[PDB]
Copies of this chain bind each other. A is one copy, B any other.
Amino acid sequence: LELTQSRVQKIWVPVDHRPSLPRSCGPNSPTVIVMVGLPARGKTYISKKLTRYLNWIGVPTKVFNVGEYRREAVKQYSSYNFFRPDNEEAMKVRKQCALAALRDVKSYLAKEGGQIAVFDATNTTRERRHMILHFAKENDFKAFFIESVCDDPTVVASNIMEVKISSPDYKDCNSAEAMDDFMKRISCYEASYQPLDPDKCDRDLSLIKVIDVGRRFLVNRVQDHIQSRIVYYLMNIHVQPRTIYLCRHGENEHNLQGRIGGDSGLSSRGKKFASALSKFVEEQNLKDLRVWTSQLKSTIQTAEALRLPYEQWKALNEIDAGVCEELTYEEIRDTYPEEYALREQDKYYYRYPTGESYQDLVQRLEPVIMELERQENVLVICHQAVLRCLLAYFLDKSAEEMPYLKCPLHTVLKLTPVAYGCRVESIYLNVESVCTHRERSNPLMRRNS
């Protein structure tokens, strides 16, 4: 009925004429995601990636790798003997490591504002899992299990070579031995490993059993929206090798006049960039390649130069500056000085009058991201702000740094799957253009001054 619009987010909230003594209060249950499976099954991989996605879409998440807790308690690794079921002392340390991790999980979900906590450990026994349930139960946390099952020696072998042997545990080992020691380590967990059994013992557990690297899934009783998304997400990511290329439209006319937004076409240099891009793609010699653009003339003209089928996406359109479209930063500061200042102090959440915020872009780009995960080779020709959002997702950058990532014109960012994330390579196509990057940039409201 009677409200006021927040200055940064432009959100309508009710005016709280806090009486004499303003009462605050503060601070949807948090979720503990429990990874399950033998080592070298991709649990850490899934953990890190899922967390990357969730934080990007706005759900604060953190991974709690029990392994790191162990490396912290036991300075240097020696061999798999540490993991033998008969190693009574090591068992105490391992148990202590897991409980210490949960301790931090409690502090995260109950005292640091986190919503999701990924408990990354083998958690291969009903006994370990029951303990976690109890823990969750007493702290009022929902529990969701993700088990990875893979009995393909080629896969396990490969997984070991990609992330295991180069672990700090094997700092003083050659491939031959690290590989041999890890295999023995896995054997240690095999005897008491009790996979999840939803059609029986684990009927009441909320879980997803990822089988044969995503070939098949077994989902049991999803509880909420959050558990709905993850499941959706896990069923769309793959591990096939491929490359993702990201770049902006060749320089446009508004770029030259320092004008934001609009729908201007390519400048002579922008067109030059287009051919260069065509040459670059040709040289990459990719068997197949999808090309995506926004619906703004700028990106489509660039795509045309490629002579390849491309698909337009309205979601890739540049951020909408509202009443500031087509205006220069100078004109914005002069006409909307307060709006200008507000954006500089909170560039991620700031929303343009009748326009958008970087936050809006993320919600808007979520489906572009979901498709990128499903695809193989893809070239995305877009815009500065948009590019920053996608890049933030792939490179796991925070919301605070997202609106400042450097995404120059005429430059292609080549992204490749490496280890637990994405490797990025920058390739400038050698065509001049303007630079549209802008970095971040009291006494009277106090006595004495």
Q: For residues 216 through 246 of chain A, which have their beta carbon under 8 Å from a beta carbon of chain B? A: 216-222, 225, 228, 231-232, 235-236
Residue of B nearest to A356 (CB): B314
- Asked whether A374 is an interface residue with its Cβ less than 8 Å from the other chain, the reply is yes
CB distance from A67 to the nearest CB of B (A): 30
Q: For residues 281 through 322 of chain A, which have their beta carbon under 8 Å from a beta carbon of chain B? A: 295-297, 300-301, 304-305, 312, 314-315, 320
Give the chain B neighbours of A236 by CB distance below 8 A: 228
- Asked whether A436 is an interface residue with its Cβ less than 8 Å from the other chain, the reply is no
Query: In the complex, are the beta carbons of B225 and A371 less than 8 A apart?
Result: yes
Give the chain B neighbours of A2 by CB distance below 8 A: 301
Query: In the complex, are the beta carbons of A295 and B232 less than 8 A apart?
Result: no
A419 to B215, CA, bound (A): 36
Give the chain B neighbours of A198 by CB distance below 8 A: 216
Q: For residues 91 through 140 of chain A, which have their beta carbon under 8 Å from a beta carbon of chain B? A: none
Query: In the complex, are the beta carbons of A301 and B1 less than 8 A apart?
Result: yes
CB distance from A354 to the nearest CB of B (A): 6
Query: In the complex, are the beta carbons of B235 and A374 less than 8 A apart?
Result: no
Residue of B nearest to A2 (CB): B301
Which of A5, A215, A220, A314 has most chain B Cβ within 10 Å? A314
Give the chain B neighbours of A266 by CB distance below 8 A: 1
Q: Which of B1, B3, B235 contacts A222 (CB under 8 A)? A: B235
Q: Which of B11, B215, B219 contacts A295 (CB under 8 A)? A: B11
- Asked whether A164 is an interface residue with its Cβ less than 8 Å from the other chain, the reply is no
CB distance from A31 to the nearest CB of B (A): 16
A236 to B217, CA, bound (A): 16
- Asked whether A253 is an interface residue with its Cβ less than 8 Å from the other chain, the reply is no
Residue of B nearest to A364 (CB): B364
Query: In the complex, are the beta carbons of B374 and A354 less than 8 A apart?
Result: no
Query: In the complex, are the beta carbons of B216 and A12 less than 8 A apart?
Result: no
CB distance from A304 to the nearest CB of B (A): 5
- Asked whether A274 is an interface residue with its Cβ less than 8 Å from the other chain, the reply is yes
Give the chain B neighbours of A271 by CB distance below 8 A: 1
Per-residue 0/1 for A188-231: is the Cβ within 8 Å of any B Cβ (1 yes, 0 no)? 00000000001100000000000000011111111001001001
- Asked whether A14 is an interface residue with its Cβ less than 8 Å from the other chain, the reply is yes
Give the chain B neighbours of A235 by CB distance below 8 A: 219, 222, 228, 231-232
- Asked whether A78 is an interface residue with its Cβ less than 8 Å from the other chain, the reply is no
Give the chain B neighbours of A371 by CB distance below 8 A: 225
Query: In the complex, are the beta carbons of B1 and A305 less than 8 A apart?
Result: yes
Query: In the complex, are the beta carbons of B216 and A312 less than 8 A apart?
Result: no
Residue of B nearest to A295 (CB): B11
A127 to B305, CA, bound (A): 51
CB distance from A253 to the nearest CB of B (A): 14
Q: Which of B12, B215, B315 contacts A297 (CB under 8 A)? A: B12
Query: In the complex, are the beta carbons of A11 and B312 less than 8 A apart?
Result: yes
Query: In the complex, are the beta carbons of A304 and B216 less than 8 A apart?
Result: no
Q: Which of B216, B315, B363 contacts A220 (CB under 8 A)? A: B216
Contacts from A to B (Cβ < 8 Å)? 1-3, 5, 10-14, 198-199, 215-222, 225, 228, 231-232, 235-236, 263, 266, 271, 274, 295-297, 300-301, 304-305, 312, 314-315, 320, 325, 354, 360, 363, 371, 374
12 A–B contacts, CB within 8 A, in A order: A1-B266, A1-B304, A12-B263, A12-B295, A12-B301, A217-B218, A217-B219, A219-B235, A232-B232, A314-B360, A315-B363, A325-B354
